[PDB]
Design a protein around this ligand. Structure first.
Ligand SMILES: N[C@@H](CCO)C(=O)O
Ligand SMILES: N[C@@H](CCO)C(=O)O
Ligand code: NA
Ligand code: NA
Lengths: 330, 323
């Protein structure tokens, strides 16, 4: 019964949900010969009430190099980057839900992702299978991908359909723990753009640049626009699309007018829809935000690791699209 | 650059789609530093594979890097694959009957990461990888539509087609097992359910504990009565706790018409789990190209250095006495 030494960066909603899920499932972990021990938990304010023992809280960065895993849920990009690099350089894996970090700091992190050191299932659609879904879809050649990747904005549109205001729905989504610390990221399409980038890199181009995604959000939408779409037989959603234009992959995020019977329109959670050759049309859906939903993703990766599987790899080379693709905007 | 020496067992619709997919996608493989080299294709009936590669009799597998099996049956493929597994050679298979019935012999190799079998449930639609990620949570209930032939038949009988006429149409389309009994009496669903249970909740789950029935009581009139009640009938494979133990069943179920499982056009797996919540995957569960996508996914999984599909490390406790 060896120690599994975990350094946890972040003690907010996700880090806490993680810490507690680990404790609750500690029995399950003995089935691999380990007992989880947290070396420490990086938090901003050690005085806040928190379901993590005081004795483990760290206000300043702590040495990571004795850890077996670093789990990162601390927010931002540059700071987590500088903290995880020394661990990665030492061959310590990282488990993360940090889609901005992966999207924006890929020059530094790609070499370690290539070595199977980075697990990030929870960085897209939380614990809903998304990266594992695309790992399987590698069996085919991608024709087109369209996803509703951002939970906060799905929630807002679902509530506006029911007549609720933008502002009301937003505030609710922040209370549910769906929104980013900057909710602009959610509502302007940027969070969906981060996630789209990561899907592109896994599936078709390991160097795909975040800056190439063309993103717009939901700031022009209102209950009246969604009610006019309901009368046309349509639902408006924020959709992240990857498709071929002139022999190159084009990535875009934008509101789209969907037929109301489409899988993407009827999904209650977040959703990822793929057409690929020769499989055909496949889709996955589930909760794409929240503390528990995200911790399920991080824990799934912890189990992937402990089972002996490596992390999520980028696509082994870039390849061009098989066909010219094209949903209608609002 | 290394040669990947592949022994393919089966030259039917699946074997053939797989052979052609591997050669068509040989550039994809060279991005892992390999070149695919088939040793031979074992064939039952002496298709879209060169005649010179066909083998009417079994061939030594021990110099293979990988064995791929899409032969069907149990004991014949088992005896052909076991010497390879004993030598540490991995197996990629779509053969759900084999895994469900010969688990006493196959489990120890599955536990060492030598068996890849995504294609064995819902073909190349993610099902085993979906549950691998769901292990982050604990299962409360699982329900799937795991057989394509019976989904086709029910869908056609909704439209007023008779059982026999839909089954023949399913047979032309290539969905049905060679004996359609395995489809229509729920057995094929019950093989697949067993495999899902062993991955997620109990690595010793016996195929014999699955309580399976098929679609033989169903007709166009029954499905129309269900439609008038706002329901669809489907053949559903369920996994749920009852008095402290996991139970597995296959049977026709009256579903709400707007349920994800009722609205799915292909196979579907629907789960509630703690703390994730409700998740769902759907896509084609049958067919040559669909199956071949699964087997090739597994090949790429293997070549990237990831092990095969592991059983659950230990039986898990049910959280809910459901139904
Ligand atoms: N703000 C994100 C959180 C989960 O990544 C969302 O709404 O999807
Ligand atoms: N006969 C099976 C093939 C897929 O394994 C079906 O109908 O689902
Ligand atoms: Na995910
Ligand atoms: Na599958």
């Amino acid at each position: 019964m060896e120690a599994l030494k975990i350094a946890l960066l972040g003690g907010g909603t996700v880090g806490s949900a993680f810490y507690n899920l680990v404790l609750e499932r500690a029995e399950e972990l003995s089935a691999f010969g380990v007992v989880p021990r947290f070396l420490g938990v990086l938090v901003r304010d050690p005085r806040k009430p928190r379901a993590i023992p005081q004795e483990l809280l760290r206000a300043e960065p702590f040495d990571l190099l004795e850890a077996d895993l670093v789990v990162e849920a601390m927010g931002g990009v540059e700071a987590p980057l500088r903290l995880v690099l020394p661990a990665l350089e030492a061959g310590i894996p990282l488990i993360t839900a940090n889609k901005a970090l992966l999207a924006e700091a890929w020059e530094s992190l790609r070499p370690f992702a290539e070595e199977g050191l980075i697990y990030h299932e929870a960085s897209v659609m939380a614990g809903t299978p998304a990266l594992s879904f695309l790992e399987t879809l590698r069996g085919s050649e991608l024709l087109e991908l369209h996803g509703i990747l951002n939970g906060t904005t799905l929630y807002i549109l679902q509530e506006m359909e029911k007549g609720r205001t933008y502002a009301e729905a937003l505030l609710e989504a922040q209370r549910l723990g769906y929104a980013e610390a900057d909710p602009t990221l959610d509502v302007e399409g940027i969070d969906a753009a981060h996630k789209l980038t990561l899907l592109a890199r896994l599936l078709v181009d390991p160097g795909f640049p975040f800056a190439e995604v063309e993103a717009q959000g939901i700031a022009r939408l209102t209950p009246e626009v969604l009610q006019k779409a309901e009368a046309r037989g349509e639902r408006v959603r924020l959709v992240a699309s990857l498709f071929g234009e002139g022999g190159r992959w084009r990535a875009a995020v934008a509101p789209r007018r969907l037929p109301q019977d489409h899988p993407l329109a009827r999904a209650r959670g977040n959703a990822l829809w793929v057409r690929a050759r020769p499989l055909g049309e496949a889709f996955v859906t589930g909760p794409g935000a929240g503390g528990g939903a995200t911790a399920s993703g991080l824990f799934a990766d912890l189990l992937r690791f402990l089972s002996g599987a490596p992390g999520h790899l980028p696509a082994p080379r870039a390849r061009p699209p098989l066909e010219e693709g094209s949903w209608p905007g609002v």
